[PDB]
Amino acid sequence: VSPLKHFVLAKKAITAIFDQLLEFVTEGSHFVEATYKNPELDRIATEDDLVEMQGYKDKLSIIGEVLSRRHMKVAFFGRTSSGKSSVINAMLWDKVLPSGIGHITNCFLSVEGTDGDKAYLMTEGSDEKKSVKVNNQLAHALHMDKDLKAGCLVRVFWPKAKCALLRDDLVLVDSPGTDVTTELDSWIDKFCLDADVFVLVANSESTLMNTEKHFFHKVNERLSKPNIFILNNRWDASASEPEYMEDVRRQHMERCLHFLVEELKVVNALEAQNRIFFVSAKEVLSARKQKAALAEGFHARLQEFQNFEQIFEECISQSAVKTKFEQHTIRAKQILATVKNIMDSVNLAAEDLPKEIDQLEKIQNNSKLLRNKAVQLENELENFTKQFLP
Amino acid sequence: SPLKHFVLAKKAITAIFDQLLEFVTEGSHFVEATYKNPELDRIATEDDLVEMQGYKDKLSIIGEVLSRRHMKVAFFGRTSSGKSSVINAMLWDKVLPSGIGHITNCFLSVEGTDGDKAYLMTEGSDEKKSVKTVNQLAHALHMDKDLKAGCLVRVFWPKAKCALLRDDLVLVDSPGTDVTTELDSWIDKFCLDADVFVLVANSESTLMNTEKHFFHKVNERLSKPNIFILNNRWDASASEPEYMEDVRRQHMERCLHFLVEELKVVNALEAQNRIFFVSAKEVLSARKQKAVALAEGFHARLQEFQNFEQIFEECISQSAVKTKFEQHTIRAKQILATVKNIMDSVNLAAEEIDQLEKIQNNSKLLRNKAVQLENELENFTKQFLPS
Ligand SMILES: Nc1nc2c(ncn2[C@@H]2O[C@H](COP(=O)(O)OP(=O)(O)O)[C@@H](O)[C@H]2O)c(=O)[nH]1
Ligand SMILES: Nc1nc2c(ncn2[C@@H]2O[C@H](COP(=O)(O)OP(=O)(O)O)[C@@H](O)[C@H]2O)c(=O)[nH]1
Numbered sequence: 001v002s003p004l005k006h007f008v009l010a011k012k013a014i015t016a017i018f019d020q021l022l023e024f025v026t027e028g029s030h031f032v033e034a035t036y037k038n039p040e041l042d043r044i045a046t047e048d049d050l051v052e053m054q055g056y057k058d059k060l061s062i063i064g065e066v067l068s069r070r071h072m073k074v075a076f077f078g079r080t081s082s083g084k085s086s087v088i089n090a091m092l093w094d095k096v097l098p099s100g101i102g103h104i105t106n107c108f109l110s111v112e113g114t115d116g117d118k119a120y121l122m123t124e125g126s127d128e129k130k131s132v133k134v135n136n137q138l139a140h141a142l143h144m145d146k147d148l149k150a151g152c153l154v155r156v157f158w159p160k161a162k163c164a165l166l167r168d169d170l171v172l173v174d175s176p177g178t179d180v181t182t183e184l185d186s187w188i189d190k191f192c193l194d195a196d197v198f199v200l201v202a203n204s205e206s207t208l209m210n211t212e213k214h215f216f217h218k219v220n221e222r223l224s225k226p227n228i229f230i231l232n233n234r235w236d237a238s239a240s241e242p243e244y245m246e247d248v249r250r251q252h253m254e255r256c257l258h259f260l261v262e263e264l265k266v267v268n269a270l271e272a273q274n275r276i277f278f279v280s281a282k283e284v285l286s287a288r289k290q291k292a293a294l295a296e297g298f299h300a301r302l303q304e305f306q307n308f309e310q311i312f313e314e315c316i317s318q319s320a321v322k323t324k325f326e327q328h329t330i331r332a333k334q335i336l337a338t339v340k341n342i343m344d345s346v347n348l349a350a351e352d353l354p355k356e357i358d359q360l361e362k363i364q365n366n367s368k369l370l371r372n373k374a375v376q377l378e379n380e381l382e383n384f385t386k387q388f389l390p
Numbered sequence: 391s392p393l394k395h396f397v398l399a400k401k402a403i404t405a406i407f408d409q410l411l412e413f414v415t416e417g418s419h420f421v422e423a424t425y426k427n428p429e430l431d432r433i434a435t436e437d438d439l440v441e442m443q444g445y446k447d448k449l450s451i452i453g454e455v456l457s458r459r460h461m462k463v464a465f466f467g468r469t470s471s472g473k474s475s476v477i478n479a480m481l482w483d484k485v486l487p488s489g490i491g492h493i494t495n496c497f498l499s500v501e502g503t504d505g506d507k508a509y510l511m512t513e514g515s516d517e518k519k520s521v522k523t524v525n526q527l528a529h530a531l532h533m534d535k536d537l538k539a540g541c542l543v544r545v546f547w548p549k550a551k552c553a554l555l556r557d558d559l560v561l562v563d564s565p566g567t568d569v570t571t572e573l574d575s576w577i578d579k580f581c582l583d584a585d586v587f588v589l590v591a592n593s594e595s596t597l598m599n600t601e602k603h604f605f606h607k608v609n610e611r612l613s614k615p616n617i618f619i620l621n622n623r624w625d626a627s628a629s630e631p632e633y634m635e636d637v638r639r640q641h642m643e644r645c646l647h648f649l650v651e652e653l654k655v656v657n658a659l660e661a662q663n664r665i666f667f668v669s670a671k672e673v674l675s676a677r678k679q680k681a682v683a684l685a686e687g688f689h690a691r692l693q694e695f696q697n698f699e700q701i702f703e704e705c706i707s708q709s710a711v712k713t714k715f716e717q718h719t720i721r722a723k724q725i726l727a728t729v730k731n732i733m734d735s736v737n738l739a740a741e742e743i744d745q746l747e748k749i750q751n752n753s754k755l756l757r758n759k760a761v762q763l764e765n766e767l768e769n770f771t772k773q774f775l776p777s
């Protein structure tokens with residue numbers, strides 16, 4: 001006994017550590033602020049120190065929330081028409097989300113499991129379990145009037161009996177295309193930035209753009225190094241021009257590897273192997289939506305979608321301790337290290353009237369005692385990593 | 391004749407721009423002197439100085455663009471929207487590297503030649519190499535051992551085969567935008583100063599801001615860009631016909647908003663004849679069959695590619711005076727108007743202090759030189775750009 005209990009122990013442990021962390025950094029932020037702003041002190045603490053510590057307080061509050069959340073959030077991200085909606089529709093075995101040519105998905109869509117045997121949707125502040133067939137009115141931009149305003153979230157519920165993956169506490173998120181408008185991008189941040197796992201749906205007819213990559217650098221800048229699956233979707237395109245298939249596949253694989261391993265430095269090359277796939281959502285959906293001449297390599301592309309689903313499931317369940325917590329604990333260690341440096345910098349600055357020197361040594365004592373609280377927390381995080389991680 | 395009308399126009403406008411450039415260099419020096427003078431803060435502002443310096447630069451580069459022997463048409467777009475394939479369709483053969491993934495990994499001039507065989511030339515080589523060598527130089531799944539520099543291969547296609555090339559026309563196939571920073575900086579160096587742009591958009595998707603940002607950059611550095619938008623891959627709309635008209639409407643509205651509201655380069659009626667829905671792949675396939683079941687509406691998409699080619703040809707031949715010069719003359723009028731405002735602002739701000747009235751007199755005399763140039767530009771526009 002048991003996978004579930006191992007997770008709940010881990011959650012209580014790390015959440016409790018992060019409580020201590022957040023109060024520590026808030027206190028240190030107030031100390032540094034006070035020292036910087038005091039007109040009596042010859043530049044003891046710097047503005048940069050203050051901004052960094054304030055940034056860390058914010059960072060840690062948001063990460064705190066992410067840790068304590070009841071659910072594992074998976075955000076789907078990509079350019080317009082790479083295949084985000086269609087990938088989810090394939091995982092669900094039915095065309096249940098708005099999909100098509102042009103800009104379509106014009107709202108954010110939660111997808112969760114339900115114990116009931118029928119699907120439904122719910123809208124901002126409504127108990128009403130509306131028909132899943134109403135989606136287009138709310139989420140499909142060829143239906144929606146161009147006036148409709150700044151939000152939104154529509155929560156789709158799909159029966160757990162159909163679709164294994166939705167059990168339990170998993171939440172999939174279909175979003176709009178990146179880089180369509182500034183406002184849409186700011187909403188894509190608000191909704192998707194704090195996701196536990198990202199599925200980058202790339203267009204395998206094309207290659208990876210920098211605006212697509214920039215998002216994941218932003219995730220790291222604001223929170224922690226992102227857990228990323230790359231689906232090179234539309235791979236059925238390579239059935240035309242088989243004389244280059246392997247060369248094109250090699251190009252994508254090399255570029256995606258470079259993105260995860262060299263640019264983000266989130267994963268090593270061997271790990272990245274099991275995060276990059278070549279698939280056709282369209283084919284998988286078409287085949288699945290049928291069990292009451294085929295295009296070449298269909299079966300290979302199907303088997304890789306299945307591998308993606310297997311590995312995706314292995315992470316949000318078996319390795320949910322790792323998936324939910326690891327990257328945030330690493331970032332916690334990093335932030336603490338920098339906080340220690342700031343406290344040291346303030347201490348040494350303090351070394352260079354009787355009331356004025358007495359005030360200055362009080363800053364020294366404060367900075368040292370904060371420093372050792374930081375080392376205590378570093379040890380508690382190191383213990384957590386030992387007892388709960390590889 | 392048409393040719394003589396053009397050469398007259400070129401000599402006229404180039405001569406005007408010489409006068410323009412000297413005027414703005416002088417005004418830039420005046421504004422700089424007034425701003426930097428410690429006796430007289432705050433008569434001219436830093437923003438005034440930066441604007442005037444920017445205008446000097448702008449005008450030098452536009453001067454060069456005006457005085458060039460050839461009409462350059464740059465093809466621009468995302469990776470795999472269909473740039474290479476559009477050109478391959480215009481030439482009736484698969485002559486340029488095309489395929490899934492990142493392919494076009496150098497810049498490719500395409501010009502007419504009087505000879506009956508096609509060929510290529512590389513920097514800096516007399517050798518007319520076989521057009522069948524292209525892939526080794528330009529196709530990123532092929533390319534031989536190094537290479538790079540961000541370079542140019544000049545393709546020459548027989549004029550006998552493709553009507554459009556017979557002028558001093560130069561088509562430019564480029565790499566995909568937003569792939570790498572260095573590729574983007576080369577795309578600027580090569581394509582930014584193009585006389586005409588063909589934006590090959592992916593009609594399965596919608597227009598991204600990185601795609602639009604390029605053309606804002608053209609405007610920031612030079613003049614509002616002459617832009618054709620080809621919504622390529624439109625054969626995709628065969629698969630989902632119940633929304634075809636709605637998707638078409640979406641693209642048309644977005645493209646219209648881009649040209650008319652965002653760039654403010656053209657009115658809605660003009661923009662109608664700059665936006666098209668086509669399948670390069672289909673057109674190439676049909677044409678290369680010179681050398682049973684076809685998709686609907688193949689024929690519609692073909693007729694629109696043909697309309698694009700007709701209107702494209704009507705512009706860099708019949709209306710070549712317009713195409714080459716108009717947008718630069720408009721920008722010239724705009725800059726002069728703002729220069730006038732700067733000189734007025736300095737004059738009013740000016741309201742031992744003999745020095746102060748000397749700035750007033752200088753600002754007024756510069757202002758009236760600006761009005762003289764405005765009239766010379768207005769005369770040019772009357773005589774060479776009706777109605
Ligand atoms: N051939 C092919 N078409 C696809 C694939 N995935 C999606 N599509 C098509 O491209 C469009 C996808 O739009 P969609 O991705 O659902 O909306 P998004 O949210 O903007 O990505 C639809 O018209 C799909 O039929 C694929 O793997 N292969
Ligand atoms: N279905 C379809 N495919 C196209 C069209 N235009 C180009 N393609 C294909 O899309 C792929 C990319 O074309 P390419 O011209 O290399 O794109 P570029 O690198 O952006 O110039 C090739 O395999 C082409 O055959 C089109 O209008 N419809």
Ligand code: BEF
Pocket residue numbers: 079080081085100101102103104105106175176177178
């Ligand atoms: F066409 Be989408 F859902 F960005």
Ligand code: BEF
Pocket residue numbers: 467468469470471473491492493494495564565566567
């Ligand atoms: F496929 Be590209 F525009 F290099």
Ligand SMILES: [K+]
Pocket residue numbers: 080081099100101102103104105
């Ligand atoms: K779409």
Ligand SMILES: [K+]
Pocket residue numbers: 469470488489490491492493494
């Ligand atoms: K390509």
Ligand SMILES: [Mg+2]
Pocket residue numbers: 084085086098099104105174175176
């Ligand atoms: Mg979608």
Ligand SMILES: [Mg+2]
Pocket residue numbers: 473474475487488493494563564565
């Ligand atoms: Mg190309």
